[PDB]
């Protein structure tokens, strides 16, 4: 049957807040921190996001009636109110499955954030959780190789994987900038990283950086007999210009490649990464600008939200935080937006985050990688709170050894392989990290020589963003 | 200042820019294995103990990836023991091959160990 | 030249503050407002944001010395106490040409606003804008055709341009998608577009909707004898898929072609604005999710910058906010950004946002798009804010009319001619705004009825970003 | 967990036949119409083609200690006989989703239907109906237009 | 010729357990098998790219590992990658990369892939030199019973034209169905270039090829080493006999599991080369090499009383 | 479990994985030759033993497939010792070579029987 169209505004309450609504396991469903406006209710608030993120608009439109709403709408089945907040609230909506295009995290943001931010009727709007149903993931390629082809290709077992981030960020040359990848190699570090910022540049072209950077990776890993990598950026303005650069890499035939998902957005990244599972390429995901979208609790979107797009985007390994060094890190926020990044099934956790149940029909997992202000001495920490299956990269840490980025190389790979053993033989890493970093530099000449170069460095600022 | 040297400083991935290992410190490290439910295996290489490339250039391909095992990896085994007199047999019969330890995870099928466990002479 | 290496972690002011310096006019400026962590100096904050958004690391590295560090490195030159705020200071930061990739917005974001904003010594950080070099400028095409070409492919002068969102934002039909651009279009109205997230859907597949959509363009036109476009979105998971819609609508001969440029991307907005530029193709660029980024004044990103980054990257239209709309917009920041998008050289003005002067080196005027919660009687309003040179469109303000979409059509159009006519004769649109609305329903029954069903109809909230 | 290797032949029912399992949404069910020859007992029947259509062979082998064969293996959930007949029962076998490649009919025919039918100790197979997951439905582009876009 | 391989039927192995493995865990499987004496690994039919495991990172691992073996053997080795898939460009994208790695065969399975895929690949292993191993997967709903339905050989003659080096025969000995005079019939129709009608084995039509190549009967499906004298003087030299269960169900292992097919087949050569009936003299000649090879020795004494014996669904 | 060797096991295609053929041995596989009317040729090779790819990587190439002739195929041979005669003379003439005896069949154009007569010290 049909209702008479009757043009006006009404109340988006009347159509989308919907607290009877049972979700089906189809649906998307949505996490949302909103902070109304004064004198608009918690009811109408979430309706209104519900509605003109999914079919509703501002009035009454005839043209409802010729389909039917009520199987298309996105809904908000429940209100929950913040702990020690007044007119802050947590409202789930839930989405049809119908709504959203297949294979394209790009459509999938266009409808769940797209303008709901902007409305004059919320102080601020924060995108907390997001549970994608499996029927959905199936839809997305996912990371080309995954966690566990990556250590095949890599023959790589038993510990996190190593790496450094060449420094100065910007204006070396390529020659010197492949000299840094040679010696910072040899040492024992699998990866070496082109910086984030570094794509094609007046101080240094792709191109040559790509052929030089090569060329150091290989002598290196002659030297060494461990095979070894160096992130070649495809970062580019144009979809052309960064394929060139994936190509060139599979034609020099190194092993990884890496994006920056969010600066070339999702539309790029995913053409990358199914360039990269066509071709054998590693593909690397820098996390930035994520902070301008996912510092404050008050406004945004969180990074598990971002997380999850990159797994069913692509990407081979994802950024995750240090908790321990310059920028912000939570642990047990962290903690579990790494797992949802590295496993099949995770439960909701309200005191990690998670506001859903997510599950990735067996999409493979992404590596977390732990960088930024993190030096030695943070090595037992970091192997306790990601695991083995993770990257360190210690870019300053290797290229401010005293000695040079050989000897820096190697005290961060004897740091980690005795903080490996440890945790084997049962020791507690918390507890005994310092002293088991204090064995090390008896027997390691560079070892020491880092240690006290970084003994006293902490950060520890208050965090803005707590659960 | 210490310069790190170029010459027969070949590498053996994880624990191999560790002090070497006492038979210890070898049992200590299979007990973690077993103690986590993984399933060792042992595997030697006598002709290429150094990933090469020879037959393609592809992204993602090398050879000497791939080693010889040794008897079948040993489900259903407890016994730290078992591994260490197999790693013995291995060595017995092939004394000038490289030999490391594995340990398999069927949750994940990824190996979740490897760590050199015997080296010919001069390596 | 050459000083010694020490290695050690030395405060960023050291090398990275330098209030004597005198930006080159080449140099791209940024103003951030820097929020520092209680008992982090005003000057660290500065330098760190500068040094780890150009060539800084947490510890001294040695290879600083291989290049002329002093020539790319990026500056805080000048910093300001934002008054009525304790611990926030508007930061001014200069960055060398050479550290920009040529043509690439991609790479620009990447630098300045990657990974800075994660910083844990700063609670907050928010870009408030940029000057970008002429010099820079000069390296992108900007928008495929402007504010000129398209007027003059359109043959559509001395009026603002109207335009239609059609409405269910999702599930309609891709058939009757078509029944409601051909009345909508028949009525007066110059556009019709696909709501945002109307991408390819299992409710209905874009090649359906672009042919249906074709079609009721052409009807429309023949019978009105004025051109007519409908902006197909070719919005996409990935950009083979985004060319594919694009190449489709060439072949169709349609006007406008409209992409989301921050859920799809920088990189390939930029690859589909070269494709619109060479085949004659009009783009409307819809900025989904820049809430997300913009609303807070504490943290984020003003849409001031990413309004500049669209006119580099490319597009012909950009939605511009409405002032008197659901969503939020500041007139006196909103007229501002404006006349960053449409003129050729805007000086610096703090009173409407506007931290730098910038000039565009005859890069073509975007035209401004006014959407959303808009009716006939904020059009005298829109016709003040906006000027001439913009597009007003009325979504619910067209499908909401009681009589349907073609006289809905006609009181927008007629709403507006009227509003332009009195402008013309030297009535005050602010003032006389209702009066010229009034007259014009005498003798506009469709104007009429439109009138009394939006007669209450406001939105006036408290604004969360003033300047 | 491991469990020793052992060779040799075993019956398929051990492995493959679990009238306890509780279908998940994300499996492929098969109807399958059984006809075992001359003193093969229909569980067995069941088990030998959940097992030859997912991941069993004749005899045991080594590699499946590297995977989890419980995760992965297609399972008889239910055996009923048809009626008027002796020798003839519906057995029903489900099969998990990651058995199957993503958009490919092809696949989805070369592991319940590919080799079954052959086996010696059966007389007559039939697959009568398939319960397709949703989640590999979505997998599928399915028809260019359909129905209501066709009028 | 051109896999320098002559005098005995060729020597393969299915991968096992049929799904599940991942790309790396297959690659060792195919060395040790390899490495043993065997001539062929192969992708089982239904493994394409899954979940599990994708098909590039398969086809890198398998190359690699038959690389391997081929250097350690001394002798040429080859993986059947399967090229089957949902759209004739993801067909074409696999055989393409196996080209890439310059390996020396690949397979499809034609009738659930179908005849106009199936012709495609073909005309491009023509164009660049690669093998096409055919599984005949599906075929049973057609051809088991006698009522309804295609018979084999008019599937055989159609896989013959459309195009194939190698199509599965069945083993007649095996845990699939076959009747020895039947499969002989077909057998005939897929390698000889005249076939005289003989309605005993199922030829109701002389049929002539017009010296178009000839296809090699490939036996697999639950056999042994004590099944091999019976397939040796079934079907002859020209044929792949290929051992799934036989070579990863071996208790040593996989390399002795292929040794014991390889010293188990070339003892039965010998034997009738020697003048030997290999029916009646089968069990002593795989005993009497039982004497001098462990790896024949252990596999026999697990497989000993392994037979597969039922009525047959189609007889003449 | 024994543990198949990884080094010096070459193998030389059919018969090379049975125990060394006695002389009566390889006079019957001459004979089977003979008998299936197959014409007798001795192939010999000293500078590469196995198959490599040294030219191209193409599918379907190989290299040292071929060796060398050793005099022509005898055709028309009726008579076992011939065959045996030749391999003496051409062993004494190469005493570094490998030699193998094949069998060709004029029908299928096909070589029916291929197996190594003669290997070099070291083999
Ligand atoms: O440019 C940098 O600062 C880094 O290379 C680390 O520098 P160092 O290795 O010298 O410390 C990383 O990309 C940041 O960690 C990015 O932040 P996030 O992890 O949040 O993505
Ligand atoms: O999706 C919508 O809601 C609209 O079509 C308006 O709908 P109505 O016209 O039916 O109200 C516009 O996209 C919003 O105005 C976004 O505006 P902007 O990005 O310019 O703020
Ligand atoms: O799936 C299988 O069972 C096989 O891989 C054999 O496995 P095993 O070697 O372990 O038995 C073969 O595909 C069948 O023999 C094909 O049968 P057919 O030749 O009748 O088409
Ligand atoms: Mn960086
Ligand atoms: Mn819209
Ligand atoms: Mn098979």
Redesign the interface.
């Known amino acids: 049957a049909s209702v008479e ?1 009757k ?3 009404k109340d988006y309450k009347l159509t989308y807040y919907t607290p009877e609504y049972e979700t089906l ?2 649906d998307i469903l949505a996490a949302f921190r909103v902070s109304p ?2 004198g608009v209710p918690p009811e109408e608030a979430g309706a209104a996001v519900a509605a ?13 009636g ?4 009520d ?2 709408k996105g809904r908000c089945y429940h209100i929950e109110p913040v702990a020690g907040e007044e007119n802050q609230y947590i409202c789930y909506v839930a989405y049809p ?11 999938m ?3 769940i ?9 919320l ?3 924060r ?1 907390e959780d997001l549970r994608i149903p ?6 997305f390629q996912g990371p080309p ?1 995954g ?3 990556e ?3 890599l ?5 996190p994987l190593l790496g450094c ?9 390529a020659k ?1 900038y492949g000299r ?1 990848v040679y010696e910072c190699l ?3 570090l699998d990866f070496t990283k082109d910086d ?2 570094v ?5 240094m072209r792709w191109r040559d950086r790509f052929l030089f950077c090569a060329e150091a990776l290989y002598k290196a ?1 002659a ?5 070894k990598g160096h992130y070649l950026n495809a ?6 210009d ?1 394929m060139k650069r994936a190509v060139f ?2 034609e020099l ?3 990884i490649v890496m994006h ?1 998902y969010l ?9 990358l990464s ?1 360039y990269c ?6 593909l690397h995901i ?1 996390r ?9 609790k ?4 969180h990074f598990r939200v971002l997380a999850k797009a990159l797994r069913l ?1 692509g990407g081979d390994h994802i950024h995750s935080g240090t908790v321990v060094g ?3 890190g939570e642990r047990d926020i962290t903690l579990g937006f790494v797992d949802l990044l590295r496993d099949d099934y995770t439960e909701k956790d309200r005191s990690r985050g998670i506001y859903f149940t997510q599950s990735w ?4 997992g992404v590596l977390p990688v732990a960088s ?2 993190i ?1 030695v001495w943070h090595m037992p920490a970091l192997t306790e709170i990601f695991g ?1 299956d993770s990257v360190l990269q210690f ?3 290797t ?6 980025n ?2 820096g190389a ?1 005290a961060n ?2 740091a980690l ?2 903080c ?2 440890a ?3 049962g020791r507690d890493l918390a507890r005994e990290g310092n002293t088991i970093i204090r064995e090390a530099t008896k ?1 390691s ?2 070892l020491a020589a880092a240690c006290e ?2 003994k006293e ?1 902490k ?1 520890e ?4 963003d707590t659960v | 200042m210490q310069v790190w040297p170029i010459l027969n400083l070949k590498k053996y991935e994880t624990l191999s820019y560790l002090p070497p290992l006492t038979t210890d410190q070898l049992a200590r490290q299979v007990d973690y294995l077993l103690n986590n439910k993984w399933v060792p295996c042992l595997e030697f290489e006598t002709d290429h103990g150094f990933v090469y490339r020879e037959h393609h250039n592809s992204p993602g391909y090398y050879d000497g990836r791939y080693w010889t095992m040794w008897k079948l990896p040993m489900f259903g085994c407890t016994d730290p023991a078992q591994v260490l007199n197999e790693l013995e047999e291995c060595k017995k019969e092939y004394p000038n091959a490289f030999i490391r330890i594995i340990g398999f995870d069927s949750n994940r099928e990824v190996q979740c160990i490897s760590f050199i466990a015997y080296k010919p002479a001069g390596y």
Chains 1, 3 share one sequence.
């Open positions: 169209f043009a006006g505004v396991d189809t406006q004064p003109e993120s999914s079919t509703g608009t501002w009035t009454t439109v005839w043209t409802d010729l389909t039917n709403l199987r298309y499955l119908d709504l959203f295009e297949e294979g394209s995290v790009t459509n943001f266009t409808s954030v797209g303008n709901v931010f902007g409305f004059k009727a102080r601020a709007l995108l499996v029927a959905y993931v199936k839809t190789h966690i566990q082809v250590r095949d290709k023959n790589k077992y038993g510990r981030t060449i420094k100065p960020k910007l204006g070396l040359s010197n840094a040899r040492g024992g984030e910022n794509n094609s540049q007046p101080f890993q030297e060494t007999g461990e095979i970062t580019a303005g144009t979809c052309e960064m890499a599979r035939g190194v092993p920056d600066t070339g957005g999702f539309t790029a990244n995913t053409t199914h599972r066509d071709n054998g390429l590693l820098h930035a600008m994520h902070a301008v979208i996912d510092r404050q008050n406004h945004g979107m985007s310059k920028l912000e029909v067996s999409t493979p930024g202000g030096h083995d870019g300053g840490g290229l401010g050894h005293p000695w040079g050989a000897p190697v790979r004897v392989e005795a490996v053993q945790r084997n033989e027997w000449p560079e170069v970084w460095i950060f600022f208050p965090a803005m």
